[model samples]
Target chain A: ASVQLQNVTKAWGEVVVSKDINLDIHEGEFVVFVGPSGCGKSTLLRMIAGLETITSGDLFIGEKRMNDTPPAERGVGMVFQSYALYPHLSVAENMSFGLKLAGAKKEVINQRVNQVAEVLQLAHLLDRKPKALSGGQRQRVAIGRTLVAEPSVFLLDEPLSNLDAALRVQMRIEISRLHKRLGRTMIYVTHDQVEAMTLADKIVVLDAGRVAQVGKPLELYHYPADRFVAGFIGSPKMNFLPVKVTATAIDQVQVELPMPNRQQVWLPVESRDVQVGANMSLGIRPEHLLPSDIADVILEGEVQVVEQLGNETQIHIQIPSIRQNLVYRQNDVVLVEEGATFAIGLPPERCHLFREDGTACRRLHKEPGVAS
Target chain B: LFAITTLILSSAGLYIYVYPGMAGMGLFVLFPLVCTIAIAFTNYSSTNQLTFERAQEVLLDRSKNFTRVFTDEGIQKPFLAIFVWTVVFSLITVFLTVAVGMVLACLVQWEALRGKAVYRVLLILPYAVPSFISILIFKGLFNQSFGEINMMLSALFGVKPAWFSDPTTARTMLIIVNTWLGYPYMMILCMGLLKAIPDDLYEASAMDGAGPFQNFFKITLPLLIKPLTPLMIASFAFNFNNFVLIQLLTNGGPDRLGTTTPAGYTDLLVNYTYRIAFEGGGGQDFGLAAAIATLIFLLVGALAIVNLKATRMKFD
Candidate 1:
């Protein structure tokens, strides 16, 4: 079923936790809600599940207004962060509990449970109590419990937060497969951007209860709507440099960097009503900062630190003008001594520019996998 | 060498700091326990008195106090009756209080209820007041003819029960008074336990189409019951020898018929022992009382073991 949130707002008295949220979640789409802690992503999920009351606005599920609908009636099944499996119940019993409560026939309940258990690889774990199950096993049982309900939409709240890294990766892939096999609308919430990027067909990036940006995963990665999304979407976070616009055209903008050399570069992006000498911020991903000879613009800084991660080398450089160390990520090992003056390149088309208000000037260049 | 000396000095200092508590435990707790165990074997009474000489002779003849409890009909009948009654009283009181507490605890958590704070305050009012004071107040209110309870009973139901004179009613009244005093602690504890239950479980249940009662039976009760086991056992043990409520409220009156010693219908094992030691017309038989007291200790000690086992039963 498709889910829609129109002008939805949630507040606790004067403190608004979710502000005028609008979203369109298509049927069979895998959508992810990603944000830092206390951004109200979980609260918004809860609101959709009808666990939280929407203060204002309409929530529609399958073309029916669900503002006052009970969670069970909303055709949604949720997997909690804590797994929330009943401790005393065996895995089979836990999965079958909801069906029993709904007064389903025993044969049908057993059939559904067995089917979900088979799919989740919980068939062997049916008789074991939740306390006896491993963390990953318990997580599977949590998912299986919700799956047995066979609701139209599957909501997962950081379900892998408790697992180890290896297990988290494995489960993430399993969930992706499950979504493909089930082909149901699945809305997931996580603070792990990697999980969001890998799993989401579309990602909603929230900042302090407001939707900062919403787009496809690669679309967000390539062309962020604002400064927050730009800084938030990529790993080895995007390095931000203070710049002043030296010149501007409808399709291009030229800005001066803060380096002592006063390096200036023209970037391909749409700038509307932009005036010359207007202060702006430039964003570039760590990986996009290339070796000096291969790129359009050069920056000079001293190598402050080097992290050798076998597969990748991340160098932190101390530029004279930038307040924070500029991070440069290289795919392979780069043998460089600390305190050496380093020159790195920035590609103009890959650069992002934000005005003083933090709104991105739309990139004119199209990147692979991102729609224009 | 200095390190060894420093270690020795620190150990000595630690002992010095612990000396007061050790002394107090020995003098008051352990000593009385030893005395009671010794008395259980002896013929110590108002006539024979408690002395080392008497204890020495009593030690040689170790079965007097214990044998009398089983062999003599006058002692055996009342002893068995009171023993049975004590178990019944404790079991019933614990069950009633915990049941009422669990209900109230769940009720207060109901989102639709108005003025939860008001209900919590009123529900917990009994626990806040000292139990002995409440027991005394209940005593007055349950008086047969002149008390407010009978007056209201007559006005409402036309049934002024013989609360003290009738053994069944007296036991019933004791349970009522005790339940009132006891449930508040259980309520507070249940509330805390309820809070420890993560909110997400209930939310998950809501997604599963669980109603309030279903949530309680499936989620709340099962989760709360595990942690509640040890405490419930402790409550049972406490009620097993609850002497004050009986002594002040009923004085273990409505005496059991044809008993030689001063045993009553509502007398628990503790009250019966108290009577034999202090208020018996047969002149304060301390040996017999100590023997019974030793038995009580054994029962409660067994309960402690069960409680420990319950605590060790891991929740996860």
Candidate 2:
């Protein structure tokens, strides 16, 4: 089932949490809602589950208004972050509890439970309680518990977060495969951008409860609609450099690049009037900046620190003119010594220019997805 | 020499560590317990009271009372009667405390409940006030004639129950009063544990299509049992030997008609022993009292250990 929220708002007394959220989730689509903690991603998931009131809006689940429905009646199965398995029940009992409560036949409950147990590879451990299960196994049982119910929409609230790094990756793959097999309309929420990018057909980026941008993961990474999205969507964050528009043309603006060394860079922006002498921001991701020897010179800065992670190296560069330290990530190892001055690349077509009010100046060409 | 040295050192260290507790325990607990066991083997009665001159007589006057106490093989009598009544009293009291305590906890913790702060604090007053005071109050309250309890019954139902007078009503009164005193402690403990139960389970259960009643039976009760079992066992054992409530409330009156013993309708093992020790004007049977006391200890101790084992409700 698909969900549609029209002008949904959540507020507490004089304070507003989610201000006018409007989103349409398509059926059988894997939608991931991503943001920082307290960005109301979990709250948005809860609202759809009917665990929370819509406050003010018409919420439709498969074209039926579910604003006032109870959670059990909503046909939504949710896997909470804690997994919340009944500590006293065995894995099989936990999985079949919902079916039993719904008055399913003994044979039917057993069949569904065995099927889920087999699919989740929990057949051998069915009788073992949750306390005896490993983290990944517990997570699977939590998912199995939800899956046995066969809800129209599956809501997972950071289900893999409690697992360790290795298990997180493993369960992440399993969850993605489960969606493939089940074909349910799944709405997942996580603060992890990688999980969002890997698991989502479409990503909804939330900033302070407001939907900043809702698009494909690559679209969000490449064509962020604002400074916040551009900065938030990418890891190591996009390097922001303050600039001034020297002149404006038909579809491009010539700006004075004021960092590393005084230089002029040409950026194609939206066909809109750019006020000359107005302050603007040039946003370019760390990976977008190539070797200065191959691309145009963008900045020159002192290398403050070097971090090596075997496969990749990240450098924290101190550009004297730009107040914020710029981080540069390279896929292969770079043996640059700290305190050594280095020049970084800035592709003109790759640069995003944002107006002073944090709105992005439209890019002229496509920018490939950075880390997805 | 090395073994002797290490043994001496270890024993000295043990003494240093547990000295303060052992000092008190030896004087207060260990001494009385040992003396009680020793006295149970002797026949120290009113005619054979322990005195400085007759210390040898008290210790050496060994004639076991176990045979004499329960010797009536045709015995639908004091020993059998009081034993059955004690078990029933403890079991019923424990069951009602848990049932009523759990209900009170859930009611106080209910989401729609208004003025919960007022109710929660007031609900613990029975346990908070000294038991002697509350039992005395309940003694008057359960009085058959001209008491407010019967008066209210007259006003409400046009009949007054002869509490503490009729054996059935008296049993019911004892159950109600003990439940009132005991349930509040259970309620407080349950309230704390209930608060600690993650709201996630109920949320998960609700999402799993469980009704409010199903959630209570399935989730709430099961989660509460592990923490409540130990407290409940202690409660059962306490009621088994609960001397004070019966002493202050019923005084074991509504007397059992035939026996010359001080046995009554509501006399528990502890109260029955108290009467055997002090009430019979012939002599104070300190030795027989100690014997009964020892029997009570073994019964409560053995049952507690077995119950704890059966439920697997160990802290370990």
Candidate 3:
């Protein structure tokens, strides 16, 4: 079933969370809600699971209003961050408990249990209790138990945040495979942007209980709607340099670029309301900055720190003229010296101009490169 | 380096190192039990008191006293009939106390009950008053003609049975009064244990689609006994050897049918042994009384093992 939430709001008397949320989840699309902690990403996922009461809204599954449906009757399965499995029951019994309560015959319960157990590779561990299983094995049983119910939509709440890095990567692939294998709509909530980038078909970046932007994963990464989304979506984050707008074009803006000398750079922005001499910011992602001359705007900064992560090395730069620190993400074994000045470049089309109020007027990328 | 050495030495006999467990057990159990068994083999009494020479005659007398206990004497003698009544009284009183306590605990702590604290205080009022004082109070109330119990009975249905004048009616009142005093004690113990059980087991069962009643049988009751299974068996043994209620309520049913009988009709073992050893029965024969008490202890100890094992094996 494709689910739709129309004006769905959650409020506990006076405190509001997830205000006026409206979204459509198709039958087989994988949507990830991502933000910093306490941004109501998990709150929104819980509301869809019917664990939280919707204050005022209409929720629909296949266009049928389900505002007051109970969690068990909603036919939605959820895997909590804590797993929330029964500590007393064995794995097979835990998976089939809900089915047995529904008066399903013993054979039907066994069939569904064994089917999910095989799919999860949990057949041999079915006789063990939750206390006997490891953290990763218990996590898979949590998913297997939810899958046995045959729900139309699956909701996962930070399901991998408890695991270590290697296990998180492994389980992320399993969830992606489970989604494609079942062809069911899935809504995932996470605070990790790398998880958001890797697994999401559409990333809904949220900030302070509001949806900052909702689009494809690369769309959020390349063209953020505001300063909040721009800063939140990428690793090593997009850097900002305070600038003053000097002139405007038909679909472009010219700003005084902070280079080694006073140089000006023109960008393809179609915003007419941007006033001249107004305080705006030029936003550049770390990967777009370089030392080579294949750049439009140039500046020199002292390399303050370097982070070595093997394939991609990031160098943090402190510029005195701008009085701000910016990171340059270079993807190779590049040489960098701390406490020394190096030329940094920001390509014209790769840069963004944000107005005084943090709303972004994106550059029209007429000749976009680098398909990967 | 020395901290682990201290920790390792203390771990072997941990309770002894930290507390008075080993010392307390030796002082309390080893000394008192050996002395009681030693005193039983002698002719210890108010007269013809125990010494080695007195015990030799008492033990070798071809002993009608020892032979009479197991010979079935047909309810005429004190030992056999009182033994049967003791076993019956202990089993029935333990069962009633636990059952009434369990039911009351569930009712007062139920979700629908409001003002549970005030209701609990009210239900425990019988135990709040000292049982020794309350027993004397009930003795007057069970008077045949002018007692408060008879007065109430006459007002309700115009009938008052002789509670102190007959064996059948008197034993019933004894059990009734014992139940009133004991159920509240068991109920309090159960309340403490039930409070420690997590509420989420029931909530989890409800989400699994079990009804409230079903969840009680499936989750609450089974989980409630997890910490109490061994404790309740000890409770049963303590109640089995109980003697205070019978002594205080009926004075061990003092209205005997005839002049020859020493033990009263409602007399449990502890009360009968007290009368035989201290009161004017067989000239206050202490050796025979101690023997009978030792026999009763052995029988109760055997049954307790069986009773505990049965309760240890149940689910749902």
Evaluated with TM-score, which candidate comes out highest?
2
DockQ of each: 0.59, 0.62, 0.21
Order the candidate numbers by TM-score, best to worst. Answer: 2, 1, 3
lDDT of 3 at A274: 89
Candidate of highest DockQ: 2
Quality of candidate 1's docking, in CAPRI categories?
medium
Candidate 1 positional error at B256, Å: 3.1
Relative to the unseen true structure, what is the Cα RMSD of model 1? 6.3
If you score just chain A, what TM-score does every candidate get?
0.96, 0.94, 0.94
TM-score of 1: 0.89
lDDT of 3 by residue, A1-372 (tens): 888788888777788877787888878888998888878677788777777677887788776676687666777777776776766678988888777777668998898889879878888997888778887898888887678877688888887878888988987998889888878888898877888878888878787777677887777767778888888877777888888798887888888855556677688786668889987888888877867466656677677888887897888787766767888887777777688777677778777778899888965874343242
Chain A alone, model 3, TM-score?
A: 0.94
Candidate 1, A123-210: lDDT as tens digits: 7887888778676888888888788877788888889988688988988999999899879999989878889888988989898889
Sorted on lDDT, highest at the top, how do the candidates line up? 1, 2, 3
Question: In candidate 2, what are the lDDT values of residues B77-135, reduced to their tens digit?
Answer: 67668778988999989898889888888988787788988988888888888888878
Model 2 spans > 4 angstroms off:
A271-273, A368-372, B1-21, B50-76, B280-286, B289-296, B303-316
As for candidate 3, its clashing pairs are none
- Clashing residue pairs for model 1: none
